[PDB]
Amino acid sequence: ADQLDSLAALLTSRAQVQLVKGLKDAAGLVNEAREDLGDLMMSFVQVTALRLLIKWKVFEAIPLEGTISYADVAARVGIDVNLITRLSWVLVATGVLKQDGSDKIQHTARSRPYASRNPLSAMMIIGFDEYLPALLAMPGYFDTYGKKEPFGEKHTVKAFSEGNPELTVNQILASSPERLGNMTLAMAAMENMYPLSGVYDFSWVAAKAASDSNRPLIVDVGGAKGHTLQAICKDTPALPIERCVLEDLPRVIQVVKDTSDAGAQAPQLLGMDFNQEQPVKGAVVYLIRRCLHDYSDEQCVRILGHLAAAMAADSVLLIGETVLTNPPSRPTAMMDILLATIGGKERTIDAFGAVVGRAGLRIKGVCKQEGGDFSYIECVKA
Numbered sequence: 350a351d352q353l354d355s356l357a358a359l360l361t362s363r364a365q366v367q368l369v370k371g372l373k374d375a376a377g378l379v380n381e382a383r384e385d386l387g388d389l390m391m392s393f394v395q396v397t398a399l400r401l402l403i404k405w406k407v408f409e410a411i412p413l414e415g416t417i418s419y420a421d422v423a424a425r426v427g428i429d430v431n432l433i434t435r436l437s438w439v440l441v442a443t444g445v446l447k448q449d450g451s452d453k454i455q456h457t458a459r460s461r462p463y464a465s466r467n468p469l470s471a472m473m474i475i476g477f478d479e480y481l482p483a484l485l486a487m488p489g490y491f492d493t494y495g496k497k498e499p500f501g502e503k504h505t506v507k508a509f510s511e512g513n514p515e516l517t518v519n520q521i522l523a524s525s526p527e528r529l530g531n532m533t534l535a536m537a538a539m540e541n542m543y544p545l546s547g548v549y550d551f552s553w554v555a556a557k558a559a560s561d562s563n564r565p566l567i568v569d570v571g572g573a574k575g576h577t578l579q580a581i582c583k584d585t586p587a588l589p590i591e592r593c594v595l596e597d598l599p600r601v602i603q604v605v606k607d608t609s610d611a612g613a614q615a616p617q618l619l620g621m622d623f624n625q626e627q628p629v630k631g632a633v634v635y636l637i638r639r640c641l642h643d644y645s646d647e648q649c650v651r652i653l654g655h656l657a658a659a660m661a662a663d664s665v666l667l668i669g670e671t672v673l674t675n676p677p678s679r680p681t682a683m684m685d686i687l688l689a690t691i692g693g694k695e696r697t698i699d700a701f702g703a704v705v706g707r708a709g710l711r712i713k714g715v716c717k718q719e720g721g722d723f724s725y726i727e728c729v730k731a
């Protein structure tokens with residue numbers, strides 16, 4: 350253990366993706382269970398103070414620069430100064446806020462984002478509002494439904510924790526557009542996970558584009574608003590977006606059309622259900638990015654099967670997903686459990702290989718993002 354202690358010690362000497370990972374592992378080593386439990390409990394109180402002070406517009410009342418008294422803050426937001434102080438003190442002690450003197454509060458780099466509506470503060474809100482209750486409900490959920498991996502769009506941990514297990518997550522939300530708004534803004538933060546253009550080379554697709562002037566190039570299966578297609582084609586004249594196909598449910602496709610500027614360059618648009626047969630045959634590339642992790646292996650096999658039958662011998666299927674290492678990293682282990690609250694999971698390359706093989710495909714290679722585990726798994730017909 351004395352080496353990591355030294356590794357981090359030389360890291361902190363220069364200080365005066367893993368710059369701070371070793372600081373997590375060092376903390377783990379030295380702490381005993383009772384220090385772990387107090388740290389965990391402090392996390393829950395810290396997030397609660399964060400959520401309330403965002404909700405009550407306190408961070409907004411605190412100037413980005415300079416100092417303001419607790420009294421003045423409380424008068425601005427119209428709230429009991431004692432309650433404002435007690436919750437601020439949680440953030441002072443953890444270093445999210447900074448106290449000057451006995452009575453004065455101020456922002457830090459770590460708290461300024463919470464002073465406005467933005468993807469970070471949106472993520473804070475949905476985490477507290479849309480995932481924490483599901484995690485807290487997990488002991489009762491697994492007593493109620495059986496201690497097995499949760500899948501299916503009804504009776505999610507999330508719907509259970511909200512008191513209506515018969516609703517889907519989307520039905521639950523379409524009843525309150527405010528929750529809708531927070532969720533959509535929050536997902537913008539990682540709307541650009543690492544992109545194909547760069548991480549994957551489509552030069553060979555241009556050669557296919559010339560050799561067959563007639564065939565579909567890239568089909569983005571469940572591609573939402575088609576940001577990934579736009580990025581791939583943007584400045585490649587041999588990769589024409591007009592030869593590509595954006596597929597998603599009819600409701601989201603309709604929104605794509607209703608929110609697109611006239612005369613803009615667009616892929617073909619096709620409303621469809623990727624649990625049923627794939628309408629576009631023989632394309633060069635089928636891309637399914639961040640979709641399979643919402644589903645059981647069995648549903649993933651059905652989805653991939655439709656793609657395999659539509660694919661030609663020289664077609665490739667690109668699966669854009671996190672590929673867990675065995676054991677997984679902290680943030681991907683974390684997401685793995687969050688996905689369980691909504692009926693999904695992350696997977697190792699072995700688990701993907703089992704699902705891919707069952708769909709009559711085989712994994713030809715994997716391109717992994719630098720400094721993370723998000724990958725494109727390149728598959729071809731078996």
Ligand SMILES: Nc1ncnc2c1ncn2[C@@H]1O[C@H](CSCC[C@H](N)C(=O)O)[C@@H](O)[C@H]1O
Pocket residue numbers: 540570571572573574577596597598601621622623624637638639640
């Ligand atoms: N049955 C279905 N058929 C087609 N699309 C579906 C679907 N069920 C969910 N989706 C779509 O799958 C997407 C999952 S989110 C992933 C979006 C995009 N690939 C990205 O990289 O961010 C959503 O756009 C959703 O509309």
